[PDB]
Ligand binder design. Structure first.
Ligand SMILES: CCCOc1ccc(C[C@@H](Cc2ccccc2)C(=O)O)cc1CNC(=O)c1ccc([C@]23C[C@H]4C[C@H](C[C@H](C4)C2)C3)cc1
Lengths: 257, 262
């Protein structure tokens, strides 16, 4: 009777996730392990060539790579926002609450999905057209050399769970419906939905990974890791603001971010 | 079945050790707080004058400092109780000795604040084994530095207490907190995860059996671990500010080692 509505919710979220996100984990994995070619950016020259032959839409190199990261993050926010609207009950919530949920949830989701594009050696960029190495990113100067490393460390641990797209679709939804975000006006509806998304995620993981003991608990514990990454990220972005005088963009451009 | 029977046995063991390791339980704390009795009544410290009379009731030169050192001693004592409970956790003492220290190093404060909630309500906190009760306002009324050390704990407490867990639930939960295979610097992560995995199963069954109508309590409880980390970080930072404003205030050696490189 009810275990049916959970599978329906599960399938529904998956389908919606496929529609909203261009580069899925299944695709990114094939590209990454080989069994699928991505242009590789591992040093200054390879970057120079990559952006002149492939011209990635997203003066100093460290500063330009950091900005392309923001640009892509803004692009990603729209995909997540669209995906959110497909979660049963989301659009029916108080409008301000929907905005608050998205405002605080996009960073957690961004790093969660970013892991689907990373391995211990690098990250896929431009919808898989490229692969920027971990070492090259770690070789950037000033405080740019370590803005991505924290995401890599998190990815290696998160990816060990071996979740697939269908697992992630429900996890992303649970992240969005967090009732502890500041400023919420009506927490009950939000938590009632997350509670339903959590039961669906639990069944999904038990069916999809019978051998993975307590994968559910283990995945939920990763929330701690995600928020640490986010808070740490906010603090790095601030320091870049407090200092760094070559970050200037067109006034309209800066408004966009 | 055999499996769940083993998980219930584990829960009983943990609860039994918990009663033996922690003098002041949540059950005793609630009984005092809900003042349903005439013998468990605590003396209430809500201001300076009352504080002065409390010292005569409850059987280094400033108010904030004295209260602060009183907490330092208590947490040091709490660390010793938690360390005693930890040993009862099947498999814990059998792990590499370096990892035992590491697990305790990062787990004691998360557990301390988890358990402290048992002694809190929205208005204050039990002290001196429940004999006294210090109000939230009095504590928030302290000098600029110490004035806001406890507020974050109260905010967590009222929310965590909303879960209405009891001692038997908490015993397995604090056991899970300790057996965290993702602590910084762990040598052999697998044996730790194998134990936590088994504790997580015990906690899951326990919650379902003890709170049948509390949908997804297990998950809600796990998400609370995020709040614990947060309270710990804020506190760590709050201490750095203290040792700079109060060059004359001393921190107990044990706690300094726990916060070191944390
Ligand atoms: C003020 C209530 C706060 O109650 C707290 C708060 C945090 C902590 C742990 C904290 C300690 C610390 C924080 C920062 C740095 C290192 C460690 C930690 O390390 O996590 C423990 C207690 C438990 N506290 C008690 O049970 C408790 C018992 C007796 C008193 C006295 C009250 C007055 C009368 C008498 C003498 C003085 C004044 C002290 C007894 C005060 C507190």
């Amino acid at each position: 009777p009810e275990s049916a509505d959970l599978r329906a919710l599960a399938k529904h979220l998956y389908d919606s996730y496929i529609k909203s996100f261009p580069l899925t984990k299944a695709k990114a994995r094939a590209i990454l392990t080989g069994k699928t070619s991505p242009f590789v950016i591992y040093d200054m020259n390879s970057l120079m060539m990559g952006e002149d032959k492939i011209k990635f839409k997203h003066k100093e190199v460290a500063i330009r790579i950091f900005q392309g990261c923001q640009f892509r993050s803004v692009e990603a926010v729209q995909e997540i926002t669209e995906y959110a609207k497909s979660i049963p009950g989301f659009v029916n919530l108080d409008l301000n609450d929907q905005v608050t949920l998205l405002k605080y949830g996009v960073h957690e989701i961004i790093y969660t999905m970013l892991a689907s594009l990373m391995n211990k050696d690098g990250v896929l960029i431009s919808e898989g057209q490229g692969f920027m190495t971990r070492e090259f990113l770690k070789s950037l100067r000033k405080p740019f050399g370590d803005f991505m490393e924290p995401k890599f460390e998190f990815a290696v641990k998160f990816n060990a769970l071996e979740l697939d797209d269908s697992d992630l679709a429900i996890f992303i939804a649970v992240i969005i419906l967090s009732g502890d975000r500041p400023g919420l006006l009506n927490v009950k509806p939000i938590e009632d939905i997350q509670d339903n998304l959590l039961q669906a995620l639990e069944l999904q993981l038990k069916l999809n990974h019978p051998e993975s003991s307590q994968l559910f608990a283990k995945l939920l514990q990763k929330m701690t890791d995600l928020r640490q990454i986010v808070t740490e990220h906010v603090q790095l972005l601030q320091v870049i603001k407090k200092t760094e005088t070559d970050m200037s963009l067109h006034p309209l451009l800066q408004e966009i971010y």
